[PDB]
Structure formats: structure tokens, C-alpha cells
Design an enzyme around this catalytic site. Structure first.
Site, PDB file in Angstrom:
ATOM      1  N   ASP A 129     -39.485 -62.879 -34.594  1.00 16.70           N
ATOM      2  CA  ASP A 129     -38.245 -62.103 -34.476  1.00 16.70           C
ATOM      3  C   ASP A 129     -37.484 -62.336 -35.786  1.00 16.70           C
ATOM      4  O   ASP A 129     -37.212 -63.465 -36.216  1.00 16.70           O
ATOM      5  CB  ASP A 129     -37.518 -62.443 -33.159  1.00 16.70           C
ATOM      6  CG  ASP A 129     -36.100 -62.145 -32.889  1.00 16.70           C
ATOM      7  OD1 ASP A 129     -35.541 -61.120 -33.389  1.00 16.70           O
ATOM      8  OD2 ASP A 129     -35.308 -62.791 -32.148  1.00 16.70           O
ATOM      9  N   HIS A 161     -37.484 -59.489 -30.713  1.00 13.26           N
ATOM     10  CA  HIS A 161     -36.083 -59.720 -30.485  1.00 13.26           C
ATOM     11  C   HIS A 161     -35.599 -59.621 -29.020  1.00 13.26           C
ATOM     12  O   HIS A 161     -34.717 -60.398 -28.642  1.00 13.26           O
ATOM     13  CB  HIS A 161     -35.159 -58.745 -31.320  1.00 13.26           C
ATOM     14  CG  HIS A 161     -33.762 -59.274 -31.359  1.00 13.26           C
ATOM     15  ND1 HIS A 161     -33.437 -60.586 -31.665  1.00 13.26           N
ATOM     16  CD2 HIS A 161     -32.605 -58.639 -31.024  1.00 13.26           C
ATOM     17  CE1 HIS A 161     -32.107 -60.680 -31.525  1.00 13.26           C
ATOM     18  NE2 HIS A 161     -31.575 -59.520 -31.171  1.00 13.26           N
ATOM     19  N   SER A 209     -28.939 -62.850 -28.880  1.00  8.38           N
ATOM     20  CA  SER A 209     -28.765 -62.208 -30.195  1.00  8.38           C
ATOM     21  C   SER A 209     -27.465 -62.410 -30.900  1.00  8.38           C
ATOM     22  O   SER A 209     -27.002 -63.554 -31.138  1.00  8.38           O
ATOM     23  CB  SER A 209     -29.073 -60.755 -29.866  1.00  8.38           C
ATOM     24  OG  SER A 209     -28.584 -59.805 -30.770  1.00  8.38           O
TER      25      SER A 209
END
EC number: 3.1.1.-
Length: 271
Positions: free
Chosen positions: A199, A259, A145
Site C-alpha cells: 500500500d 489500501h 488511512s
């Protein structure tokens, strides 16, 4: 568608882324180782680776882571873571642118660148040382991320520075730146871245514113828881618007868761 281886580686680486866231581873110481606781881563633881260184965141710143180484493979580673817261851133935141430087244109855213630157320086220184020680180884760077853216731126730155290659781875883433730155771274280559489915853261811132882324782417487708394868884754290549884642458408827261787843858861450681 683728282859296885581639686826395885882627587855482884884423674881470482787852471881771264835781615281423880871154714271732781150184060485220681680474571871875771718851478871886622285882493978781474196885391877063882441781641471070384570472750173843481505281216040200132936121861123844381560481470185470681481875060885086984070788480677170284570185781772871253851134813131956681885422848712616131886517728602518211613113862116611115620145430138760174580286180249142109380228430138771237611123825151882433611133853371780475612151741381670177330281681472560168440481680575260178470681580477130185170782050487071969490768380185680777781574873342887732824112762481882846721162781772782527650282680677581228470383490559340038030185380384180139370185490777781266881334786862778822847213764217851163423107174209140128883416282208450058683618070219460078290685681267681876882645885315887843749707995502827212881757677617842124745216383308428208411117721124662217680187390539290639781866885516785854398947658813948351568932496983883856181859076828578833586717581748583418480138861135554108339409285609793957852115285409588816725017862113838412518701657616845121886817995610864381781638393959495985881553854251647881714481877431």
C-alpha cells in the site's frame, strides 16, 4: 506471526474504522446504534455500541467521526474519518512542517495537525462527560488511512491531556511527524499501527522528507480479499528503508487497491 488473541483484537477494532465511513453513523442522533449497511462491521453491531457524540465532514472540513460507547468491551471509542480523495493526495499532496506544541524537535505535518486542532476543544469537552459517566472504561482511538493520521495526533495529544492509557489503532496511516515526534509517541506505548503489502499511503511522506513512523509496524502480508491469518502479520521494530511496507519500494498508484483491504473492506461506507 501473532497470537490468535492478537489477530482477534486487530480484526475487531478496524470495524469501528469501517463504521466511520458511513454518513448514517457520523450523522446519527445521540443514542442511535452503530450499523454498517454493506456488512463490514458485524462484530461492532453485535456489541450494541451506541453513538454518544458525532461530527460530520461538511463544507469547512473533511474530517468526520464519532464517540461511541461499547458496553460489551468496556470501551469509549473515538473514531476518525479523514479526506476520501486519497488517490489525489498520494499523487499531488504537499507536506509542510508545523510545531504541534507536543515536545520538540517534535514539529508535525500541518494538514494532519490542522484537522485535529479544529475539532479538539469540543471533543475534549465531550470525552470528559462520557468518561465521567463510564468510569472504568478504556479509551480506544481509531482510524483508517487519512483518519489514521488524525487519530495518531489526537491520541498523542489526549495522553498529555488527562488520558495517558488511551490506546491507538492506526490502520494504513501515512507518516505524521519527524523523528522526535515518532520517538515521543512510540515511548507512550499502546500503539497498534498496521500496513498492508505494498500500500502506497503508509509510505508517505517519505523518509527522505524528514518524517518517521511510530513503531512497531504490524505488516499484513496476505493479499487483497484474503483472510488474514496468524502467519500473515510480521512485527517490524523500527521505521527503516528496507523493512516492511516501506521496503517494497516508492509508492506506486498502481498499488492503490492494497489500501482498502485491512482485514475487511474498510471504506465500503462511501469509498
Amino acid at each position: 506471526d501473532v497470537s490468535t488473541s492478537e489477530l482477534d483484537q486487530f480484526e475487531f477494532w478496524v470495524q469501528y474504522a469501517a463504521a466511520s465511513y458511513y454518513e448514517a453513523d457520523y450523522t446519527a442522533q445521540v443514542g442511535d446504534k452503530l450499523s454498517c449497511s454493506k456488512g463490514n462491521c458485524p462484530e461492532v453491531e453485535a456489541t450494541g455500541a451506541t453513538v454518544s457524540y458525532d461530527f460530520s465532514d461538511s463544507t469547512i472540513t473533511d474530517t468526520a467521526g464519532y464517540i461511541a460507547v461499547d458496553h460489551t468491551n468496556s470501551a469509549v471509542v473515538l473514531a476518525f474519518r479523514g479526506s476520501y480523495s486519497v488517490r489525489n493526495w498520494v499523487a499531488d499532496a504537499t507536506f509542510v512542517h508545523t510545531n504541534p506544541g507536543l515536545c520538540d524537535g517534535c514539529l508535525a505535518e500541518l494538514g494532519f495537525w490542522s484537522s485535529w486542532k479544529l475539532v479538539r476543544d469540543d471533543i475534549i469537552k465531550e470525552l470528559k462527560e462520557v468518561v465521567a459517566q463510564n468510569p472504568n472504561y478504556e479509551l480506544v482511538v481509531v482510524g483508517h488511512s487519512l483518519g489514521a493520521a488524525v487519530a495518531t495526533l489526537a491520541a498523542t495529544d489526549l495522553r498529555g491531556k488527562g488520558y495517558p492509557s488511551a490506546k491507538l489503532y492506526a490502520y494504513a496511516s501515512p507518516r505524521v511527524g519527524n523523528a522526535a515526534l515518532a520517538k515521543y509517541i512510540t515511548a507512550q506505548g499502546n500503539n497498534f499501527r498496521f500496513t498492508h503489502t505494498n500500500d502506497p499511503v503508509p509510505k508517505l511522506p517519505l523518509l527522505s522528507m524528514g518524517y518517521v513512523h511510530v513503531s512497531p509496524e504490524y505488516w499484513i502480508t496476505s493479499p487483497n480479499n484474503a483472510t488474514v491469518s496468524t502467519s500473515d502479520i510480521k512485527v517490524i521494530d523500527g521505521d527503516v528503508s528496507f523493512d516492511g511496507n516501506t521496503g517494497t519500494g516508492l509508492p506506486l498508484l498502481t498499488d492503490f487497491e492494497a489500501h482498502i483491504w485491512y482485514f475487511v473492506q474498510v471504506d465500503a461506507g462511501k469509498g
